[PDB]
Structures are given as C-alpha cells and as structure tokens.
Amino acid sequence: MVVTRIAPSPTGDPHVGTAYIALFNYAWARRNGGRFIVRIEDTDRARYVPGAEERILAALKWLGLSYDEGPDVGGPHGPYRQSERLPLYQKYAEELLKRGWAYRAFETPEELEQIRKEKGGYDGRARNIPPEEAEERARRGEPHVIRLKVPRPGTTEVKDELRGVVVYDNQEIPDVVLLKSDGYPTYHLANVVDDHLMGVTDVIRAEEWLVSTPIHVLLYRAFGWEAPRFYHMPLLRNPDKTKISKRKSHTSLDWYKAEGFLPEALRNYLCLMGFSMPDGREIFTLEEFIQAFTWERVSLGGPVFDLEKLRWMNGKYIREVLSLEEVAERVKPFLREAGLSWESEAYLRRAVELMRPRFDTLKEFPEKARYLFTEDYPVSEKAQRKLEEGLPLLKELYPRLRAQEEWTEAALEALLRGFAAEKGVKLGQVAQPLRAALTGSLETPGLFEILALLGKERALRRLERALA
RNA sequence: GGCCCCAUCGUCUAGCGGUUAGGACGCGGCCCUCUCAAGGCCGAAACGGGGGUUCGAUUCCCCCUGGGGUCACCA
Ligand SMILES: Nc1ncnc2c1ncn2[C@@H]1O[C@H](COP(=O)([O-])OC[C@@H]([NH3+])CCC(=O)[O-])[C@@H](O)[C@H]1O
Ligand SMILES: [Mg+2]
Numbered sequence A: 001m002v003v004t005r006i007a008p009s010p011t012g013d014p015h016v017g018t019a020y021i022a023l024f025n026y027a028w029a030r031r032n033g034g035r036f037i038v039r040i041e042d043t044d045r046a047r048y049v050p051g052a053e054e055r056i057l058a059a060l061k062w063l064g065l066s067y068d069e070g071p072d073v074g075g076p077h078g079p080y081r082q083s084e085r086l087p088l089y090q091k092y093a094e095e096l097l098k099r100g101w102a103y104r105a106f107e108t109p110e111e112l113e114q115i116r117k118e119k120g121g122y123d124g125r126a127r128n129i130p131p132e133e134a135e136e137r138a139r140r141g142e143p144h145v146i147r148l149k150v151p152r153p154g155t156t157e158v159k160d161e162l163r164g165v166v167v168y169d170n171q172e173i174p175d176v177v178l179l180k181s182d183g184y185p186t187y188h189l190a191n192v193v194d195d196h197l198m199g200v201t202d203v204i205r206a207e208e209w210l211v212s213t214p215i216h217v218l219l220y221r222a223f224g225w226e227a228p229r230f231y232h233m234p235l236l237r238n239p240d241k242t243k244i245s246k247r248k249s250h251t252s253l254d255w256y257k258a259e260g261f262l263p264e265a266l267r268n269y270l271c272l273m274g275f276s277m278p279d280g281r282e283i284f285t286l287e288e289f290i291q292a293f294t295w296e297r298v299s300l301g302g303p304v305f306d307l308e309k310l311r312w313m314n315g316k317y318i319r320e321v322l323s324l325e326e327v328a329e330r331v332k333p334f335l336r337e338a339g340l341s342w343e344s345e346a347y348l349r350r351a352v353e354l355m356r357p358r359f360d361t362l363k364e365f366p367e368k369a370r371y372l373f374t375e376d377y378p379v380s381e382k383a384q385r386k387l388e389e390g391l392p393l394l395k396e397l398y399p400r401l402r403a404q405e406e407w408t409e410a411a412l413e414a415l416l417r418g419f420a421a422e423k424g425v426k427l428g429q430v431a432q433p434l435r436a437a438l439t440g441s442l443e444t445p446g447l448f449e450i451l452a453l454l455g456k457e458r459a460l461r462r463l464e465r466a467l468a
Numbered sequence B: 001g002g003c004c005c006c007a008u009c010g011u012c013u014a015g016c017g018g019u020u021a022g023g024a025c026g027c028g029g030c031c032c033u034c035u036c037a038a039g040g041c042c043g044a045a046a047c048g049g050g051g052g053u054u055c056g057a058u059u060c061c062c063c064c065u066g067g068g069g070u071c072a073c074c075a
Helices: A016-031 A052-062 A082-098 A109-119 A131-139 A187-197 A207-223 A253-258 A263-271 A286-292 A307-321 A324-337 A345-358 A364-368 A381-389 A391-403 A409-422 A428-439 A447-467
Strands: A003-006 A035-038 A102-105 A145-148 A155-160 A164-169 A177-179 A202-206 A229-233
Touching: A003 A016, A003 A202, A016 A035, A016 A052, A016 A202, A016 A229, A016 A253, A016 A263, A016 A286, A052 A253, A082 A102, A082 A145, A082 A177, A082 A187, A082 A207, A102 A131, A145 A207, A155 A207, A155 A229, A177 A187, A187 A207, A202 A207, A207 A229, A253 A263, A263 A286, A263 A307, A307 A345, A324 A345, A324 A364, A345 A364, A345 A447, A381 A391, A381 A428, A391 A409, A391 A428, A391 A447, A409 A428, A409 A447, A428 A447
Parallel strands: A003 A035, A202 A229
Antiparallel strands: A102 A145, A145 A177, A155 A164
C-alpha cells in the first residue's frame, strides 16, 4: 500500500514548513487509502528543545491533520521518537561495519576542521586503518564515529518522482558519519533505518533534502533494502525569496494561532503553495483537497509566503465558510485575553454578526469592537471633532429618543430619518456625530443596529455622557 | 566556488504547440451607502536573454542569466 510520514525535529517552535509538508503527506496517504505516520526526529541532543515535541504534535492536530501512528497514538512499529531507538541504529551501524559498507574514524573535531581547511571535506583517511586495529581501539573505548564507506569511484542514481532521474557522481557524495561518538545516529542513518522498519513507501519532504537522497539510496543498497519513492516539495520562502525563516517571516504555527488565524484558513492557504485545483477554485475544505490531489497539479517553484493573502483568506473564511455561531465561539478566547466580557450568547452573537465583514483575524474583533463590550473605549480626535460639530442637533434629538417606546432598528431609523428631514439636513449630519458618541469611533457598522444593540437605557445613558 | 533543483503579472498560480496568456491577493476607479468595511463592475500589471526543433512556440531541446538548496559528529 502507501505509507507516508512527517518527521519533525523538536528544536524550536512548531514550523509552518513542517505543517506544509505534513499536509501533502496526509493527502497522499489518504488519497491512496494508506497510512500517515509521525516520527519525532530528536537525535541532536545539543539543539533539542524540551516541550518542542508536544507543540508540533498539537499544531498538526490544530491544523486539522490526523495521523495513524505516532508518539501519542500508538502504532506497531514504535517507539516513534528516535531518542528511544538508539540501540537499533547501533545495531545497524555495526552491521554496515561488518558488511564493509562503513568504517570507524577516530579524528577529533579539531583535526576534522583542519582536514576540512586543507582539503575541504573529509578525505576518508580512516579507511586505511586495519579493521582489527579499529575494533581494538574501539573496545579500548577510544571515542570515534562510524562513517558511510562510499563506493569509490562510482555514480549514484536518485529518482525523484516529480523531476525525474538525477545521477550523482560519488565524488560528490561524502563518507558521511552514520553514528556520532556520543552513540547517537545522524539524520541519514536513522532516516533510512526507521523509514524501512516503519514501512514508508513514499518519502515526501522539502527540496532542501534532495541532494542528501543519494546518501540514502546508497544506505538502502548497503542494507539490501528496497528504496521508497521520493517526492521533493519546494521550500516556502521569505519575501526576499530565501527559504522562509524566523527573522524575516513568521514561521511559528503558534504565532498564527495566537494572532487569530483560523486553522482551516491557514491550511487552505498552505495547500495553495505549489498546488491548485483543476477549476482554479481557491477556497476548499481539507477533505476536498485530499480527493483532488494529484502530483500532476503540484508546481515546483519556491513560493513566497504572502501574509497579506493569508489574511484575505482568513477574512474570507470568517465571513463565508464558517457559520455565525462558529465565529462567535472562536472569538471568545480573544475577548477573554483582552479582558473583555460579553453579557450573553445572544449579545455576543449579534455583536459578532455586526462586525463579521470588518475583521480578518479573531484578534482584530476585540480591537475594533471594544466599545461594544466595555465603557473603557478610546475616542478618536476625528470622532471627537464630529461629536462637537453635532452637539446642537443631538441635544435636540435626545428628547425624541427618550420618547421612543419601540426601541427597534426599523423604528429608530424612521425616527432619525424624520429628525434629519424636519431639520432640513442630510442623515449623515446627525448619524456620524451620534456614531461618535455611541462608539468613540467613526468606522463602525450601521448606526441603527449599533443604536439598537445596547437597548434604550444603555444607548441614551452613553449618549448622555457625550451631551454632558 | 563544486554539485543539484527551479524559472508566466509585485505575490500565489492556470496553461501542458496555435489563447484577446485566464483566475486570485494586493493596487487604481466606479456602483452601493448614515460612516468604515463587505459585495458587484471596470482597469493597470507577466511569458528573463540567446540559439535551435517545428508551418507555428509561453509550451520541446541547448547554452547563458537569475533565484534556491547542499557541501557539519544540524537536520
Ligand atoms: N522552509 C521550509 N519550507 C518547506 N518545508 C520545510 C521548510 N523547512 C523545513 N521543511 C520540511 O518540513 C519537514 C520537517 O522538517 P524538520 O522538522 O526541519 O526536520 C525534517 C527531518 N527531521 C526529516 C526530513 C525527512 O527526511 O523527511 C521536512 O520534511 C522538511 O522538508
Ligand atoms: Mg494582462
């Protein structure tokens, strides 16, 4: 069948590039009724960040992805954390040693640096150490690493399903270390061992790994295992076209969640990086994406992540994909965070309804409609000027307002329309200043709905402080 | 610098020999209108350069250029 995986390294914030890749592995697996695996690649104890694992795992679920096997969902080929698989890599490294597909090298990092400075890269000098001597020095406990013994001279063919065949000359392939002197494996060794033991048949990862694939093809040969298919996706880019990074772009998935982007929208935007629906449609569900997925519709250029288009899509989701109620619910955390409270579900729902076409992120809602939940709201200088210019007619309208029994949008409008007419003046000449008094802003939703919202008492009560 | 990948509007992209080279974001205008948005309509905006192949290339091949990646006991 088809078995895919996402192999995040817990070394920092949950990365958007990881979400992007996970997304296509998930679709390919599901599209073929296969299995999507999560394997935590925590082999670099120096860069390992505690708490990073939970964060990427939580973020993948937040985005809407589900995995069939992994650290927290079980699976028949665990552990799904490489740090817990050390004896396994050890065993396989030693097997390569015995097959004469690798050798022990005992150079100190300082020496390797010198070698690199003199000849560039490693010259594979340790291959000249007698096998028995190497084993003896190993038993004595002399620190060392185990390196891949590349067949020299030679050539190595890699097959990328999206770009065709690429033939590397072994002189371009270094005798990479397979097992570090701390007993930990390097990415290359653990990747091939685990992909094979976990049954991965389709390796989908970012293009940054294409050049290292020949190393993997050689490892599969050394172990005598069948290589899986390889699909290298393009790298997400910063505005300047360099691969997306923390200092030039927001690469943390937690940042997106904290900023009020809907996971559904972010995921939908991510699907547009290197992929498109047959009919050009831009808004679609995760399930629709799975069904339409085809490698024929995947484009290879490096896409720049456009925060602006993402915000547009998030606003699109907010007003046309989700229902009023879903938005109302997803807005609560952000109200709380802003220290704002809402009277009841009915009030909140109506407030969200009035602001729906006016906010692209859940975070903008508490910011642009603060005056709807608290008396602690700012009044713009421009709102203040409009308020003063209209004080005279408001003073006159005030009593009419307090005379209104049916405090309804339909009624209030008729009342105001009349007041502006009998005063031989345009509605705006009264609407704008009333808006400023009611909200402290001159950019809000319709006046009648804003006036109606709080109810007679609250409306006039606030109007009074203004006329005061 | 060596090797490898890539190349249509500013950005994401459709196209897969013949099109007025289409859509979307963003940008400009108009409509709508009590403000601001939302929405509708209109508009400006691209095939990097040079050779080929072919009746005919945005599309097929080659070089150049540009961008990206990789040359760690990081992944
Ligand atoms: N800027 C970027 N744009 C697009 N994709 C990006 C990316 N940065 C990382 N990736 C990709 O996300 C996945 C996770 O990467 P990572 O957590 O850095 O470690 C990935 C490696 N541990 C395993 C790679 C593999 O063999 O599949 C990987 O599969 C990697 O390709
Ligand atoms: Mg045009």
